[PDB]
Amino acid sequence: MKLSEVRKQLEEARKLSPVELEKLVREKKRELMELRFQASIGQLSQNHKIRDLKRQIARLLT
RNA sequence: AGAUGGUAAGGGCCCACGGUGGAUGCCUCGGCACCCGAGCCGAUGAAGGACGUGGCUACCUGCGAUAAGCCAGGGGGAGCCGG
Numbered sequence: 001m002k003l004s005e006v007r008k009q010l011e012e013a014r015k016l017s018p019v020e021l022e023k024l025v026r027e028k029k030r031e032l033m034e035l036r037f038q039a040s041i042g043q044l045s046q047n048h049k050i051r052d053l054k055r056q057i058a059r060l061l062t
Numbered sequence: 063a064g065a066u067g068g069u070a071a072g073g074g075c076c077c078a079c080g081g082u083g084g085a086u087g088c089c090u091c092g093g094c095a096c097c098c099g100a101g102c103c104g105a106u107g108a109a110g111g112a113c114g115u116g117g118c119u120a121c122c123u124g125c126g127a128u129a130a131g132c133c134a135g136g137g138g139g140a141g142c143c144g145g
């Protein structure tokens with residue numbers, strides 16, 4: 001159900017959407033990178049956070 | 063004095079039980095033939111590929127940096143995150 005929530009917000013992200021959407025994706029990707037480092041160092045993170053983050057970006061990326 | 067017997071280092075035939083081997087029977091995701099259907103794809107970049115893609119991933123599979131996936135409509139009604 002995570003989908004409907006964000007995706008609805010995403011056109012809702014039309015205050016300066018395309019621009020705001022880039023800012024957003026950009027932010028997300030940083031989070032993900034921190035996450036890659038998280039999982040990288042080992043003792044840290046628990047999977048899906050990355051899988052869900054990737055998808056969220058793919059949606060965002062529209 | 064005269065006259066006559068027994069042993070198996072190993073081998074041979076047979077019997078019993080094995081080892082090796084994968085014939086035979088049964089089985090079948092596959093294959094063959096005919097018939098019916100259907101018949102073009104590409105610069106809006108095809109066919110076919112290379113390298114990448116999973117939290118941990120060797121290969122297969124799917125996918126393409128949005129990477130075993132993104133969105134929307136329809137189906138479907140308890141399971142799901144491929145092998």
Ligand SMILES: [Mg+2]
Nearest residue numbers: 070072073074
């Ligand atoms: Mg003998």
Ligand SMILES: [Mg+2]
Nearest residue numbers: 076077078079
């Ligand atoms: Mg006997």
Ligand SMILES: [Mg+2]
Nearest residue numbers: 079080081082
């Ligand atoms: Mg025998």
Ligand SMILES: [Mg+2]
Nearest residue numbers: 081082083084
């Ligand atoms: Mg054998």
Ligand SMILES: [Mg+2]
Nearest residue numbers: 083084085086
């Ligand atoms: Mg056998």
Ligand SMILES: [Mg+2]
Nearest residue numbers: 087088089090
């Ligand atoms: Mg049988």
Ligand SMILES: [Mg+2]
Nearest residue numbers: 086087088089
């Ligand atoms: Mg038979």
Ligand SMILES: [Mg+2]
Nearest residue numbers: 090092093094
């Ligand atoms: Mg058959």
Ligand SMILES: [Mg+2]
Nearest residue numbers: 091092093094
């Ligand atoms: Mg065939």
Ligand SMILES: [Mg+2]
Nearest residue numbers: 093094095096
């Ligand atoms: Mg045949």
Ligand SMILES: [Mg+2]
Nearest residue numbers: 096097098099
């Ligand atoms: Mg004919």
Ligand SMILES: [Mg+2]
Nearest residue numbers: 098099100101
């Ligand atoms: Mg016809």
Ligand SMILES: [Mg+2]
Nearest residue numbers: 099100101102
């Ligand atoms: Mg025809």
Ligand SMILES: [Mg+2]
Nearest residue numbers: 099100101102
């Ligand atoms: Mg035609």
Ligand SMILES: [Mg+2]
Nearest residue numbers: 103104105108
């Ligand atoms: Mg043409």
Ligand SMILES: [Mg+2]
Nearest residue numbers: 102103104108
């Ligand atoms: Mg042509």
